[PDB]
Amino acid sequence: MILEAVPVLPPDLRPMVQVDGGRFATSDLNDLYRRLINRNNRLKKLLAQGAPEIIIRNEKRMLQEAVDALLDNGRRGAPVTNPGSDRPLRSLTDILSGKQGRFRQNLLGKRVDYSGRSVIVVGPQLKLHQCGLPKRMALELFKPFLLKKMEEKGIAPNVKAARRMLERQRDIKDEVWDALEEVIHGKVVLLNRAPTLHRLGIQAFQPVLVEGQSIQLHPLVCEAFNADFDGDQMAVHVPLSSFAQAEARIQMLSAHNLLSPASGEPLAKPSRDIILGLYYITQV
Amino acid sequence: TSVYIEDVLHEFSTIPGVKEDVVEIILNLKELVVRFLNPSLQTVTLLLKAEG
Amino acid sequence: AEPGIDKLFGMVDSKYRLTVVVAKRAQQLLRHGFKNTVLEPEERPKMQTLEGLFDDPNAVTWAMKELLTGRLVFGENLVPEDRLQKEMERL
Amino acid sequence: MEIKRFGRIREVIPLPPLTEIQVESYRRALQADVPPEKRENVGIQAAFRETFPIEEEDKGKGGLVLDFLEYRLGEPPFPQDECREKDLTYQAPLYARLQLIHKDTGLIKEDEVFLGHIPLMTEDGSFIINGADRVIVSQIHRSPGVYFTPDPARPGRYIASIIPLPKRGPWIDLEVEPNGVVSMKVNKRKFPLVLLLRVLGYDQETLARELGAYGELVQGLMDESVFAMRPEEALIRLFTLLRPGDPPKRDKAVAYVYGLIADPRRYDLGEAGRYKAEEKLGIRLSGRTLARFEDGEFKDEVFLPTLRYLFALTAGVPGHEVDDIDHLGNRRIRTVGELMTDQFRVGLARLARGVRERMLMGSEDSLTPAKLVNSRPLEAAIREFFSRSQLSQFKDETNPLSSLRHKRRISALGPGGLTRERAGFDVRDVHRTHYGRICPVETPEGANIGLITSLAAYARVDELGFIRTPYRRVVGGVVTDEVVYMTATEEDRYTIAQANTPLEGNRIAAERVVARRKGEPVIVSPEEVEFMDVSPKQVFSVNTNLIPFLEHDDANRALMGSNMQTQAVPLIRAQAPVVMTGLEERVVRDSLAALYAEEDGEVAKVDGNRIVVRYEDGRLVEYPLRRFYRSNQGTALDQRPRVVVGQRVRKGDLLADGPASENGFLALGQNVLVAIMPFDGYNFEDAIVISEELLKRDFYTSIHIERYEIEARDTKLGPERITRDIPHLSEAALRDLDEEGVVRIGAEVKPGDILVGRTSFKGESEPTPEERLLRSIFGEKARDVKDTSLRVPPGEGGIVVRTVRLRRGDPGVELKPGVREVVRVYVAQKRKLQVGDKLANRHGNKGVVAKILPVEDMPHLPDGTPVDVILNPLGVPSRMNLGQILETHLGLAGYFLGQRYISPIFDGAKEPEIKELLAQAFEVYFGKRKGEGFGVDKREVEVLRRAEKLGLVTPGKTPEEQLKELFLQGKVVLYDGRTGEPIEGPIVVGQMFIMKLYHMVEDKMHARSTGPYSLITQQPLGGKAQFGGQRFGEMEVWALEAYGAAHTLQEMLTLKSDDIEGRNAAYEAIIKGEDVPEPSVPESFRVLVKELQALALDVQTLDEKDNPVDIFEGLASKR
Amino acid sequence: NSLKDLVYQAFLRLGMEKTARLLDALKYYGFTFSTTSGITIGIDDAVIPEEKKQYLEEADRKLLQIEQAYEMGFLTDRERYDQILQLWTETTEKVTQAVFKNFEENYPFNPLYVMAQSGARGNPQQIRQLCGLRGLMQKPSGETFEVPVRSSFREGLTVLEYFISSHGARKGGADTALRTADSGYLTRKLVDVTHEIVVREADCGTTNYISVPLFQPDEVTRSLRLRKRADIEAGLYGRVLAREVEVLGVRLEEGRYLSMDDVHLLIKAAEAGEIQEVPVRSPLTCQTRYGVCQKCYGYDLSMARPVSIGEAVGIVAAQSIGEPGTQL
Amino acid sequence: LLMGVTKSALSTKSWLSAASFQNTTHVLTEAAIAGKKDELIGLKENVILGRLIPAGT
Amino acid sequence: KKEVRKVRIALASPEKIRSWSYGEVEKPETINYRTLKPERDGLFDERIFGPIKDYECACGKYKRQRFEGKVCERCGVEVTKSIVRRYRMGHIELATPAAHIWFVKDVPSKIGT
Ligand SMILES: [Mg+2]
Ligand SMILES: [Zn+2]
């Protein structure tokens, strides 16, 4: 239940990485291990040479406090970095627990590969099962799909030539955009809003390539999301596997989700302006 | 369509001795009205030299 | 959308069965290639610029268009499952 | 153009210099201009005389006397221009005259010692620290002094607190315990204060005569009469009641530490604590604090009055004499001068301890300058305060108004011991005393709500953070031009009128007059009013005063519009708003953005960058112009000349426009024709539709400059040489790279193009033998060189304008250690209005451009003129911002009358006035219409009949006057343009001032397919190189699993985020055009397993049976 | 409300594709007719009824009386404060009712009144603020000021009144900035405590149920009355019948999911006075080990049909609980 | 026994969710005193390990 | 090849810690500024946590795909990525016992109960 040999984390989990000018930024774990090693070696030397009892007890106390600090900091005093930087050191328990620890970032997958984000503008010309996607960011998002599809044709010989062709926008061709339209014929993408209060904050859509910068959004989902058009942005993700494509297109597509899960009240209801128009046209 | 200056080397510079910036010069040139008298004629290159 | 989703939902008890059926059909189409289809002769999907939906622009729509016919049968255990599930992943 | 003003009020006083707070604070802090002999001592000289005269009586070499005489500073090393070009600090060296004295013979006086360099404030009020310029914002906290607060539990009694500073010092409390105890905790332990009172030399006879005479709670101290007659042994007893374990024979050790200098607050005499003393209680607090050391015994001037007055409150009632914690009269503002002074004196005390030690081990005496004082502590402390402090924050130079507001912003948080971000909900709300001193609307929405604010326009801090509101003296029935400045406490006692009350000039014109008794809206008679408000503008900040029709707007919308005023980018051709408030000229003048004629004279020469003007004195002076200066936030600051050669000017007249000034008027935005009607769906909820007319002529366009920087630094591999040559391949695109490393000016650049050609070493310890031997047999000497060269980041690029190179050959520049050179390249582009951009009015009607329509199909008037911007009415009733409607009506009147209008915020134009103006405008409009011989269109006829059926226009009138009445409503007929048929029912149209808001990468698409991954976890995040991914959080995870989505979440957690082998295999497969493989365990979980393993824990994955299955391939197993 | 009912009925009786097409057509035509119809907001559209004028006079008179009622010592500070609050809160409602009476009588096609009558934008409180008066304004202490706001945004507020309303503006801002945090924490607690519950199940042999009442036990000290239609719908819709019930000559067989029609029929029957409590299945009695059975769970989804076996009810339940919390 | 939502969330048979929720220290200590073989039921655990969710598909 | 079904968490015996780690660290010397390579037996040692380089060993004689598994001629390193330094673990043999802080400071003191 008490520990005799203390494990030492693999170096890459606490790497010393040079920042600039030879200086090295280090994880505090390295400092804690260094202090522990120094205390342990001092204990070994002191016990080897001679035993002044009070001194031996004192150095035992320092070793014990070093181990305790390494396991976690704060429960007994606050061992800190070198004086002048009064930031308490970060220990194992600090890495695990907390509002942003190991648990609250690997539970989360804070980073994804094929993602983008942009401001959103209304897309009234669109049907409900569609959304507008800027051609440049869509081209970037489907890059492997684009490479494969234009390799199906003779636009480029190999993948490296195609990537170098796409690596600069001065080499774009209308054949490239034809291929991009070819890729996304049946594909869907997930549109997402940052505060995801309920199940409808993620919705799949059929992308439509547009010329512009903003994301064109069907107005009827203006209430499914709490998304007005006062400058708020949305993110977009691109599922890869065919199995995931089927999932999104069948049970996440906005055309199939018209009623709340909180109650039978519809959320695809006509919004403010449509209501105004229909009331105007059906009044006596 | 296009503007060339013997002195400057980009759009956001300024000519010494000129009160207006290059931006102002281009904006003023934007309102210049040119009437062609030969319908077959397509592209013309007017020249301007001034001092003092 | 897709041809008659209402008909799709009517002909299965629960939607997740429908999703797994359509996607497993899509995976079968991918692995065997699009030769193992059961709507081949006349009614095939078609692109606009050319006839590209003959081969493989989108397999999910292929599977769903397949399922609207009576040529697809699905069940919890209709075939010895072990044989198929251990030949599927090695090709 | 004319300008018509509507407000009918005489501003007796004009605005004080809107930036005088910081200017006066720093000018009082630094007395360099005044002779050192001058009486002025507060500030830096106060710190010098307070701590610097170190004395040492008997410690080794006794008689150490290091005294202060004078100080001076007069020569900055460099002017600020290159100090921004080169990352220096616009500072001045500091010198001090000191001298050393001993009890023996010897008077070793050193007139000059250099001790640190202190930053010098620029003219506007900013500081340049390391190239960039920052601003130190004021802070607000508790005023030092005496306060009384009710007991937290006991409802009949209360407590008294006297609060000095710093924290590691006194904080004294008096409390009453009913058993007959007058308890007093000095620092941490309570104490019967009667012993200390006896220490003060007070006997019980005068204690009853002067203190216990009135109150019956004197028995709470007169009961303790046993130890009430101990003159001096009470000092020993009191020190004994302390627990240091030390001998009691230390008469003035801790007894006197609350004496003169060390502990008790040195607050400014008269007011900082003395007004908090004398005004609160008693008559006068002579000296700085409570102390006596001329006879060893002690004297008091605080404890006795405080106890007396406390007992008066708890027994009798002098008044409702309990002090509000948040009352503005009990709160004080530490300006930049106070913060700088305090940090300076902390560094000075550090230096004092250092010199104490240096004397301590020093042997001889002829060592005054060198062996005593070292500049490292004080200089480092000042540099740290000006660089890494919380309140010294980056300047917000997006536009002159932004800079002004940032300079006059008051913050509640600060160093940390005062208030923090976690818990402040009690104090975030406004107080009744903010009226006229703090703008109740200026606060920024978000976490820092209510904590950060800005003082009102007419506000003025007098000498110690005590905001004074101007007021006009009212004597009898006459309002005198006399203007007197009240603090909160001073105002809390009189009756104050309101600026809107009817006035006969020098006589009140009303019978029942509104007033504020004590923050209470009451109605009184004119005879009972003593003071009057100068002007309603004194109630709101500078930024809010620019919104024209505040009287018809909601506080939320007014707040958010006032915030958006700050972040409006200056346009290429920006113009003054059609409706102004009247502070535009003051804002552009006081914020030093333009150039003005300092004296009567005539212009001599005016060029694109410099103006030479010969004054009436015969002296000619040259003014240079920052032609295209990059802002802090990336905009462009230009001075455009506004005078011609040989043009007479007046004193203080305009010479050159600022970045956002039309003619001495704050111009940040445009004046456009707006039609308030719902278009198809393009202005759906808050989106905006704009014409292409605003783009065919550049009307919303802005120059944006990006400043790239790349360094060559000395490595152990060897110095990295910035050379035009490219190591391996790229030479075709090198054509734009003309000279050695730096790209040629004026050359357009695309993303992925070289800007600076930098070369590093091929190998860290050994280069590639292939390429090494390559270059060896081509050119004898090898080339151990790898390509690490700055290229345009993916995205966008414009035109290179400037390139600066700083090398080791330093003229006056310094570089980071190990860095041989640095080159900075400026690339500018002309951003044009497009869909992604956003606009806003001054009333907060936030919007985003949704579609640009071609000119033909947008609605147009009966005349050929088409409207510019179409706005959705749905946003008006949901919020409450009717100000924009009034602005639209005024703009409609002005567009035809060709004139501008100035209306004060709470003295604007009455509805009859604007109606009459619209009548004149319609007269002009329809008279011009008839001059060409046209009557009324049939479409207009049917629209009129429909409006008649809707009750808009009275029936029975000819179309002429019916349409005139419709115009009086501000609504005119429009034609759809797409159909030609008119829009059924009238439409409201006018002119609004719409500004383009700040537009960074927020619109730009951080869309990536593959980017840099982190080191600890392989979750992809880039930044400078690549955008990085998007957070998928947990709420998105919860929603994703709320559906039946199972594999989607699996792929998005492993295949696309963490599984390194999984993601590599997936990328290869999709390139190969085959289905993605099944995922594996994410690396974040392996990190978790190893982290748990680091502790004494042990986690392993088990199979269906108790058989561990190793997550790792074989790496966990040994050998 | 009519549009919402129309959409729900179309979804019930037609399905997915036709409902989506109906929504598309409705959106397109609503946009076109909103454009061609030309609804705009002018300053004169915020009409001020003259009747409120004399109302104010009356109220002022009353206040004077109440004020002299204080100067004779008949009232305490608390009594006077409560009287003033009651008087002003009554006259505010009087004025708002007068405003809508004016709008319906005179100008049916007023853009503000039109927007309020439809579900487009606005509330009667906001319209009263625009045209009438925003009388009672809250103090930072949580109480309300004695002196109300006489003017409205059609007119111009006095400086003092604007400073007063700034109190409420700041209160709203801070309350957003903190209650959002609290509600998010609550939602996280919910989603953790419920994440285990997913419907994987056979119909559990639950011979148990819950009896949903139809009458409020106590609105007066002793009185029974039928519950509101909204409560009954939110308690019964999508539930599964515990045991067979026949109330109005109609045999509701045991195990029949309750649609909207069934709930309306039951409400009508209870109005006639035949039954008071409905026995229904519920998760509260489900005997499934981890999760709930299909029957014990119910019928409500994004669809109408009974729930598919295998979808996480716990997480959607927690999200449904937490979502309105941000807007409370 | 009726307890608040927090205590019920904490005291659960699976330790992964409890450790992930409120206080990792106490939860991990308790689950380390006695070997808690966490069964992979409940969605949070399967998300943590990255395996396929029991719910949904 | 088997699927993960359960996750067991338990205490670690001292012999467990010895079995996990590959060698012991004695020097508190991370890395010298001059020698960018790992310094000593310290917290970043090469042969205690695996090679820091990509694929080559210290010398590189027996490295190639015909004979990667054959023990190196002048060396003893099996071909592997840097990922070994992500997973290979160290240990410290304290001359004196110590207690895990959790079991002594948790609100229910496991040692204390
Ligand atoms: Mg928004
Ligand atoms: Zn059940």
PDB file of all heavy atoms in Angstrom, chain E residues 62 89 115 119-120 122-123 133 157 200 229 232 239 260 275-277 302:
ATOM      1  N   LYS E  62     -54.948  59.113  -7.510  1.00  0.00           N
ATOM      2  CA  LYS E  62     -54.927  58.056  -6.509  1.00  0.00           C
ATOM      3  C   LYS E  62     -53.647  58.116  -5.697  1.00  0.00           C
ATOM      4  O   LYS E  62     -53.687  58.107  -4.459  1.00  0.00           O
ATOM      5  CB  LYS E  62     -55.069  56.695  -7.184  1.00  0.00           C
ATOM      6  CG  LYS E  62     -55.088  55.521  -6.228  1.00  0.00           C
ATOM      7  CD  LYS E  62     -56.307  55.560  -5.331  1.00  0.00           C
ATOM      8  CE  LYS E  62     -56.749  54.156  -4.958  1.00  0.00           C
ATOM      9  NZ  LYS E  62     -55.604  53.300  -4.543  1.00  0.00           N
ATOM     10  N   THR E  89     -48.927  48.476 -10.703  1.00  0.00           N
ATOM     11  CA  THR E  89     -49.009  47.239 -11.464  1.00  0.00           C
ATOM     12  C   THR E  89     -50.412  46.985 -11.994  1.00  0.00           C
ATOM     13  O   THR E  89     -50.563  46.264 -12.984  1.00  0.00           O
ATOM     14  CB  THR E  89     -48.538  46.054 -10.620  1.00  0.00           C
ATOM     15  OG1 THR E  89     -48.256  44.942 -11.477  1.00  0.00           O
ATOM     16  CG2 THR E  89     -49.594  45.647  -9.612  1.00  0.00           C
ATOM     17  N   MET E 115     -47.321  41.999 -35.954  1.00  0.00           N
ATOM     18  CA  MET E 115     -46.246  41.145 -35.469  1.00  0.00           C
ATOM     19  C   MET E 115     -46.597  40.510 -34.136  1.00  0.00           C
ATOM     20  O   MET E 115     -46.229  39.358 -33.882  1.00  0.00           O
ATOM     21  CB  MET E 115     -44.960  41.955 -35.338  1.00  0.00           C
ATOM     22  CG  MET E 115     -44.238  42.196 -36.643  1.00  0.00           C
ATOM     23  SD  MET E 115     -43.219  43.674 -36.542  1.00  0.00           S
ATOM     24  CE  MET E 115     -41.864  43.237 -37.617  1.00  0.00           C
ATOM     25  N   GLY E 119     -47.053  35.061 -34.601  1.00  0.00           N
ATOM     26  CA  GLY E 119     -45.938  34.678 -33.764  1.00  0.00           C
ATOM     27  C   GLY E 119     -44.621  35.226 -34.267  1.00  0.00           C
ATOM     28  O   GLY E 119     -43.559  34.704 -33.920  1.00  0.00           O
ATOM     29  N   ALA E 120     -44.675  36.267 -35.098  1.00  0.00           N
ATOM     30  CA  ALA E 120     -43.465  36.766 -35.738  1.00  0.00           C
ATOM     31  C   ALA E 120     -42.457  37.258 -34.712  1.00  0.00           C
ATOM     32  O   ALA E 120     -41.440  36.601 -34.485  1.00  0.00           O
ATOM     33  CB  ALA E 120     -43.805  37.886 -36.718  1.00  0.00           C
ATOM     34  N   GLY E 122     -42.092  39.972 -30.875  1.00  0.00           N
ATOM     35  CA  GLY E 122     -42.674  40.866 -29.900  1.00  0.00           C
ATOM     36  C   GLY E 122     -43.589  40.160 -28.915  1.00  0.00           C
ATOM     37  O   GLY E 122     -44.069  39.051 -29.139  1.00  0.00           O
ATOM     38  N   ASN E 123     -43.813  40.833 -27.797  1.00  0.00           N
ATOM     39  CA  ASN E 123     -44.720  40.406 -26.748  1.00  0.00           C
ATOM     40  C   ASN E 123     -45.533  41.616 -26.324  1.00  0.00           C
ATOM     41  O   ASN E 123     -45.122  42.756 -26.560  1.00  0.00           O
ATOM     42  CB  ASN E 123     -43.967  39.832 -25.542  1.00  0.00           C
ATOM     43  CG  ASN E 123     -42.898  38.846 -25.944  1.00  0.00           C
ATOM     44  OD1 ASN E 123     -41.756  38.936 -25.494  1.00  0.00           O
ATOM     45  ND2 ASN E 123     -43.259  37.895 -26.795  1.00  0.00           N
ATOM     46  N   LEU E 133     -46.067  52.607 -21.606  1.00  0.00           N
ATOM     47  CA  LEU E 133     -45.080  53.019 -20.620  1.00  0.00           C
ATOM     48  C   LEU E 133     -44.540  51.784 -19.918  1.00  0.00           C
ATOM     49  O   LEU E 133     -45.294  50.859 -19.617  1.00  0.00           O
ATOM     50  CB  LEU E 133     -45.675  53.999 -19.604  1.00  0.00           C
ATOM     51  CG  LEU E 133     -46.893  53.554 -18.796  1.00  0.00           C
ATOM     52  CD1 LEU E 133     -46.485  52.950 -17.469  1.00  0.00           C
ATOM     53  CD2 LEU E 133     -47.820  54.725 -18.577  1.00  0.00           C
ATOM     54  N   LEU E 157     -37.247  59.267 -23.078  1.00  0.00           N
ATOM     55  CA  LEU E 157     -37.038  59.073 -21.654  1.00  0.00           C
ATOM     56  C   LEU E 157     -36.219  60.217 -21.074  1.00  0.00           C
ATOM     57  O   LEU E 157     -35.364  60.801 -21.742  1.00  0.00           O
ATOM     58  CB  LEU E 157     -36.322  57.753 -21.389  1.00  0.00           C
ATOM     59  CG  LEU E 157     -37.007  56.483 -21.873  1.00  0.00           C
ATOM     60  CD1 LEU E 157     -36.350  55.278 -21.239  1.00  0.00           C
ATOM     61  CD2 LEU E 157     -38.478  56.530 -21.537  1.00  0.00           C
ATOM     62  N   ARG E 200     -32.406  -1.266 -24.410  1.00  0.00           N
ATOM     63  CA  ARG E 200     -32.134  -2.611 -24.902  1.00  0.00           C
ATOM     64  C   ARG E 200     -32.876  -3.555 -23.975  1.00  0.00           C
ATOM     65  O   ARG E 200     -32.673  -3.527 -22.758  1.00  0.00           O
ATOM     66  CB  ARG E 200     -30.633  -2.903 -24.988  1.00  0.00           C
ATOM     67  CG  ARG E 200     -29.828  -3.148 -23.704  1.00  0.00           C
ATOM     68  CD  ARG E 200     -29.494  -1.839 -23.009  1.00  0.00           C
ATOM     69  NE  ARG E 200     -28.513  -1.982 -21.940  1.00  0.00           N
ATOM     70  CZ  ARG E 200     -28.211  -1.035 -21.062  1.00  0.00           C
ATOM     71  NH1 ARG E 200     -28.935   0.066 -20.954  1.00  0.00           N
ATOM     72  NH2 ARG E 200     -27.154  -1.196 -20.272  1.00  0.00           N
ATOM     73  N   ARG E 229     -54.757  21.547 -20.242  1.00  0.00           N
ATOM     74  CA  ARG E 229     -54.558  20.663 -21.383  1.00  0.00           C
ATOM     75  C   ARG E 229     -53.079  20.405 -21.625  1.00  0.00           C
ATOM     76  O   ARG E 229     -52.686  19.290 -21.989  1.00  0.00           O
ATOM     77  CB  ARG E 229     -55.207  21.267 -22.626  1.00  0.00           C
ATOM     78  CG  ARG E 229     -55.289  20.320 -23.808  1.00  0.00           C
ATOM     79  CD  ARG E 229     -56.048  20.958 -24.958  1.00  0.00           C
ATOM     80  NE  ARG E 229     -57.377  21.398 -24.553  1.00  0.00           N
ATOM     81  CZ  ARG E 229     -58.493  20.718 -24.779  1.00  0.00           C
ATOM     82  NH1 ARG E 229     -58.481  19.561 -25.418  1.00  0.00           N
ATOM     83  NH2 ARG E 229     -59.651  21.215 -24.353  1.00  0.00           N
ATOM     84  N   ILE E 232     -51.753  17.698 -19.132  1.00  0.00           N
ATOM     85  CA  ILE E 232     -52.230  16.363 -19.463  1.00  0.00           C
ATOM     86  C   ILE E 232     -51.536  15.847 -20.711  1.00  0.00           C
ATOM     87  O   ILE E 232     -51.155  14.674 -20.787  1.00  0.00           O
ATOM     88  CB  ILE E 232     -53.758  16.372 -19.620  1.00  0.00           C
ATOM     89  CG1 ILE E 232     -54.407  16.898 -18.342  1.00  0.00           C
ATOM     90  CG2 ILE E 232     -54.261  14.986 -19.945  1.00  0.00           C
ATOM     91  CD1 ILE E 232     -55.866  17.226 -18.496  1.00  0.00           C
ATOM     92  N   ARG E 239     -47.530   7.756 -24.032  1.00  0.00           N
ATOM     93  CA  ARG E 239     -47.439   6.719 -23.020  1.00  0.00           C
ATOM     94  C   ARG E 239     -48.169   5.466 -23.485  1.00  0.00           C
ATOM     95  O   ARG E 239     -48.904   5.474 -24.473  1.00  0.00           O
ATOM     96  CB  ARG E 239     -48.012   7.211 -21.695  1.00  0.00           C
ATOM     97  CG  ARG E 239     -47.353   8.468 -21.178  1.00  0.00           C
ATOM     98  CD  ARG E 239     -46.218   8.160 -20.235  1.00  0.00           C
ATOM     99  NE  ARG E 239     -46.075   9.215 -19.243  1.00  0.00           N
ATOM    100  CZ  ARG E 239     -45.365   9.106 -18.131  1.00  0.00           C
ATOM    101  NH1 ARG E 239     -44.702   8.000 -17.840  1.00  0.00           N
ATOM    102  NH2 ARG E 239     -45.322  10.132 -17.286  1.00  0.00           N
ATOM    103  N   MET E 260     -52.189  11.862 -29.911  1.00  0.00           N
ATOM    104  CA  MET E 260     -52.843  13.111 -29.537  1.00  0.00           C
ATOM    105  C   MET E 260     -54.356  12.955 -29.512  1.00  0.00           C
ATOM    106  O   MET E 260     -55.033  13.514 -28.640  1.00  0.00           O
ATOM    107  CB  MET E 260     -52.439  14.229 -30.498  1.00  0.00           C
ATOM    108  CG  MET E 260     -52.628  15.642 -29.953  1.00  0.00           C
ATOM    109  SD  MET E 260     -52.060  15.974 -28.275  1.00  0.00           S
ATOM    110  CE  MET E 260     -50.417  15.267 -28.302  1.00  0.00           C
ATOM    111  N   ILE E 275     -63.807   9.537 -15.698  1.00  0.00           N
ATOM    112  CA  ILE E 275     -62.617   9.030 -15.032  1.00  0.00           C
ATOM    113  C   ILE E 275     -61.761  10.208 -14.596  1.00  0.00           C
ATOM    114  O   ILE E 275     -61.910  11.331 -15.082  1.00  0.00           O
ATOM    115  CB  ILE E 275     -61.799   8.074 -15.923  1.00  0.00           C
ATOM    116  CG1 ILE E 275     -61.247   8.817 -17.137  1.00  0.00           C
ATOM    117  CG2 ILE E 275     -62.648   6.895 -16.360  1.00  0.00           C
ATOM    118  CD1 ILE E 275     -60.469   7.929 -18.074  1.00  0.00           C
ATOM    119  N   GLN E 276     -60.854   9.939 -13.661  1.00  0.00           N
ATOM    120  CA  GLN E 276     -60.029  10.997 -13.094  1.00  0.00           C
ATOM    121  C   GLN E 276     -58.551  10.644 -13.171  1.00  0.00           C
ATOM    122  O   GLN E 276     -57.695  11.534 -13.175  1.00  0.00           O
ATOM    123  CB  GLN E 276     -60.430  11.266 -11.643  1.00  0.00           C
ATOM    124  CG  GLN E 276     -61.878  11.675 -11.463  1.00  0.00           C
ATOM    125  CD  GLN E 276     -62.814  10.489 -11.453  1.00  0.00           C
ATOM    126  OE1 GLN E 276     -62.381   9.343 -11.573  1.00  0.00           O
ATOM    127  NE2 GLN E 276     -64.107  10.753 -11.314  1.00  0.00           N
ATOM    128  N   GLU E 277     -58.239   9.355 -13.226  1.00  0.00           N
ATOM    129  CA  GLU E 277     -56.860   8.896 -13.255  1.00  0.00           C
ATOM    130  C   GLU E 277     -56.679   7.882 -14.370  1.00  0.00           C
ATOM    131  O   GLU E 277     -57.533   7.017 -14.579  1.00  0.00           O
ATOM    132  CB  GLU E 277     -56.454   8.280 -11.920  1.00  0.00           C
ATOM    133  CG  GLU E 277     -56.504   9.255 -10.760  1.00  0.00           C
ATOM    134  CD  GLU E 277     -55.981   8.655  -9.473  1.00  0.00           C
ATOM    135  OE1 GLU E 277     -55.594   7.468  -9.486  1.00  0.00           O
ATOM    136  OE2 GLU E 277     -55.956   9.369  -8.449  1.00  0.00           O
ATOM    137  N   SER E 302     -38.337  11.899 -32.337  1.00  0.00           N
ATOM    138  CA  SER E 302     -38.395  12.779 -33.493  1.00  0.00           C
ATOM    139  C   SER E 302     -39.519  12.361 -34.426  1.00  0.00           C
ATOM    140  O   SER E 302     -40.114  13.203 -35.103  1.00  0.00           O
ATOM    141  CB  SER E 302     -37.060  12.762 -34.227  1.00  0.00           C
ATOM    142  OG  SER E 302     -35.996  13.012 -33.329  1.00  0.00           O
TER     143      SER E 302
END
